[PDB]
Design a protein around this ligand. Structure first.
Ligand SMILES: O=P(O)(O)OC[C@H]1O[C@H](OP(=O)(O)OP(=O)(O)O)[C@H](O)[C@@H]1O
Ligand SMILES: [Mg+2]
Length: 424
């Protein structure tokens, strides 16, 4: 399987620290929900690990016990790594404690995830290149998403996204620097199809799924397939309209920020600029006119001054340093690759290594891999002739659909997720 152990810190996860005043009803409910989570993990053969610095005394309605005895009594069959009890264990903050746990359990790094809340635990997981699961049931977080508001949500995430062999519905490579992934195949070639709700009165603004569903799908599939390893940036593509280019990003920004935090990366919402309104590729296709990649190349470029501080709005003063950096590029659906190949062309010209990820792969359409014959100056507007494109190869649809993947399988995954409850 993919997930073999879950590391839990204690502060504001198993026992509150920040607040004196957590209601007893909350502690009892969290204790009971953690019991369910650990039993669920045990039933799946997933180990439960506690990682702590101090063997502090804990006051019980029965008396005072050490933290080790407390955890052993309430959550038996967990494995407690406590620096005070084992001088072997290196520091948490630097990520070294994760290396130690990996060796002790004979597990690979991305065979574990890390549930925490304290800043030291976020640092421990990210510096240890382990997926961070931000537990916010004792202390809330407002700055970004990809959160987990109660223990049940961790079980939901694991059960829905982390236990099946196929993390991607479609995936393929070309040459050595071209890597394409999509979560699920889907029919996008119908005049009716749109990824965004038709009515602004709906609280759901995506037509398929929801932000919670998609960020958790993305996070699981990217992490357990190894794509997050060494990734510095995550970014989304831009819509065709120069007046409204950030529709997907505006819906998903909150969650993409949190996924970036969990990978020790940065979400660059406006790394791409749509400087001139482009032909809408989907609409050209339904009009049965051919889509040419220069319609994208000639209307987008890399933003030399993206937002560096999504809280403050402060922009980079010099273009972000992308040379030698790994960037995850997200778009909603991929048909023939015009959008992703343009994203890749610009980022590759800036020296980056690129991973092209989509929620959906259009059924029965192959991706054409392109390289420019005119040198791209990626931080400014470029204008290429159709003859400036070298079509070097193909990532086909049919041969790269993964076993068992299908649009109906996505629909049932969404149903499974939306209605999820403790498996009875
Ligand atoms: O793989 P491709 O052949 O590039 O096709 C997929 C692209 O087409 C759609 O955008 P579109 O250009 O229709 O504009 P929109 O997002 O503004 O609706 C979709 O959102 C992708 O960006
Ligand atoms: Mg688009």
């Amino acid at each position: 399987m993919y997930l073999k152990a879950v590391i839990f810190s204690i502060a504001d996860v198993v026992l509150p620290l920040t607040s004196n005043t957590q209601p007893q009803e909350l502690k009892s409910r969290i204790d009971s929900e953690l019991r369910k989570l650990f039993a669920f993990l045990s039933s799946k053969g997933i180990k439960v690990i506690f990682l702590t610095n101090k063997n502090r005394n804990v006051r019980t309605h029965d008396g005072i016990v050490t933290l080790d005895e407390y955890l052993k009594r309430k959550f038996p069959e967990s494995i407690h790594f406590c620096r005070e009890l084992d001088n072997n264990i290196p520091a948490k903050q630097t990520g070294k404690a994760i290396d130690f746990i990996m060796a002790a359990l004979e597990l690979k790094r991305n065979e574990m995830i890390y549930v925490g809340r304290s800043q030291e635990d976020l640092q421990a997981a990210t510096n240890g290149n382990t997926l961070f699961i931000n537990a916010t049931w004792y202390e809330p977080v407002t700055e970004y998403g990809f959160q987990f508001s109660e223990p049940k949500e961790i079980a939901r995430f694991i059960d829905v996204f982390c236990l099946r062999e196929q993390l991607w519905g479609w995936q393929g490579h070309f040459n050595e620097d071209v890597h394409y992934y999509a979560l699920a195949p889907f029919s996008t070639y119908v005049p009716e199809f749109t990824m965004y709700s038709a009515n602004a009165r709906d609280l759901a603004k995506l037509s398929v799924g929801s932000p919670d569903f998609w960020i958790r799908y993305l996070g699981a599939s990217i992490y357990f397939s190894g794509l997050s390893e060494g990734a510095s940036f995550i970014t989304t593509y831009v819509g065709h309209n120069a007046e409204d280019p950030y529709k997907l990003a505006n819906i998903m920004e909150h969650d993409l920020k949190g996924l970036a935090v969990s990978f020790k990366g940065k979400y660059l919402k406006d790394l791409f600029l749509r400087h001139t309104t482009a032909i809408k590729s989907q609409q050209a296709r339904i009009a049965k006119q051919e889509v040419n990649i220069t319609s994208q190349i000639n209307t987008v470029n890399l933003n030399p001054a993206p937002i560096k501080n999504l809280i403050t709005g402060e922009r980079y003063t010099n273009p972000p340093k992308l040379k030698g950096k790994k960037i995850l590029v997200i778009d909603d659906f991929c048909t023939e690759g015009n959008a992703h190949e343009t994203a890749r062309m610009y980022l590759k010209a800036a020296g980056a290594n690129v991973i092209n990820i989509s929620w959906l792969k259009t059924i029965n359409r192959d991706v054409s891999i392109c390289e420019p014959t005119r040198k791209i100056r990626p931080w400014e507007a470029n204008t290429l002739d159709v003859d400036d494109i070298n079509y070097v190869g193909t990532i086909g649809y049919a041969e790269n659909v993964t076993h068992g993947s299908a649009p109906q399988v996505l629909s049932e995954k969404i149903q499974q997720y939306d209605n999820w409850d403790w498996p009875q």
